[PDB]
Design a protein around this ligand. Structure first.
Ligand code: PRO
Lengths: 290, 4
């Protein structure tokens, strides 16, 4: 029974869901990736209110239930302000934690650099700082994939036949390899991704999909600015995550006091797979740093 | 993103 209210911010409206943890111990703000996705796939974090960890959720500009701003502010440097415009409006000046998944992590970082003065901790779940790099690394992945698909992707990809059947064939199978491990996609996620393939964001600011990043984010690469981040931090990732662990390192590398912890036998939506123990680590990370 |  989380208060799913709405909030007008920067000319446009935004939806936000937070299940106020019984005994307020820490306020963790969530940051979904994509872009163009939604928070619906990060709901599993509910197991965190138990630890008296309050958890807020929110669909970024034009994402999910929230509305899109002028197409002019279709960037990451924008999403940032939002998070703040929102946060501030939510609890004025208070010690808050952040958790960006994938893109949201990148964002999370991006935000972390400027409005760092408003942070207690920063949890990243398979995030990134240099889009180009992430991409470069995915190819490798694709390459490793079995000829049949490794060949379909490059083929139809190098032509725009993204709709092509043989293409999707790889895609789904691929997703069941770097996005979601040994299993069946849960509701929370579905609706999320479904959103992306319906909103105007993931279409313009991202690209046809995850490994076909053609949107307004391929240039982005603030790997150097992250160095500036000095507040405590946490980074996670899977052995076979679409955003390969090799990316995570860098971050962990450019930022001290970080304790990169790769999840064994886990993919991207780690917060679901070994979710059972996933939360812990985060909570463990939070609590302690108080 | 896709699915089944
Ligand atoms: O961040 C995301 O969710 C997608 C997949 C990696 C690049 N963009």
């Amino acid at each position: 029974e989380c208060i799913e209210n709405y909030a007008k911010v920067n000319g446009i409206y935004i939806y936000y869901k937070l299940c106020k943890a019984p005994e307020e111990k820490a306020k963790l703000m969530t940051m979904h990736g994509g872009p163009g996705m939604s928070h619906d796939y990060l709901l599993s974090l509910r197991d965190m209110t138990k630890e008296g960890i309050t958890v807020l959720f929110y669909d970024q500009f034009g994402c999910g239930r929230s509305e899109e701003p002028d197409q002019s502010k279709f960037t990451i440097d924008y999403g940032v302000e939002e998070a703040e415009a929102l946060r501030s409006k939510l609890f004025g000046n208070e010690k808050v934690f952040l958790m960006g998944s994938a893109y949201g992590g990148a964002l999370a970082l991006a935000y972390a650099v400027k409005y760092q003065d408003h942070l207690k901790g920063l949890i990243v779940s398979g995030g990134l700082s240099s889009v180009p790099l992430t991409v470069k690394e995915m190819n490798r992945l694709i390459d490793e994939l079995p000829a049949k698909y490794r060949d379909a992707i490059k083929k139809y990809g190098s032509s725009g036949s993204y709709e092509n059947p043989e293409y999707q064939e790889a895609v789904n199978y691929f997703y069941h390899q770097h996005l979601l491990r040994s299993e069946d996609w849960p509701p929370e996620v579905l609706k999320s991704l479904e959103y992306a393939e319906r909103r105007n964001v993931y279409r313009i600011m991202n690209g046809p999909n995850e490994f076909t990043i053609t949107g307004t984010i391929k240039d982005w690469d603030i790997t150097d600015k992250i160095s500036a981040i000095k507040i405590p931090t946490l980074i996670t990732v899977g052995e076979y995550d679409e955003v390969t662990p090799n990316v995570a390192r860098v971050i962990h590398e450019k930022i001290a006091g970080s304790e990169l912890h790769v999840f064994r036998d886990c993919s991207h939506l780690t917060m679901w797979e070994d979710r059972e123990g996933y939360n812990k680590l985060l909570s463990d990370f939070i609590l302690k740093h108080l | 993103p896709l699915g089944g």
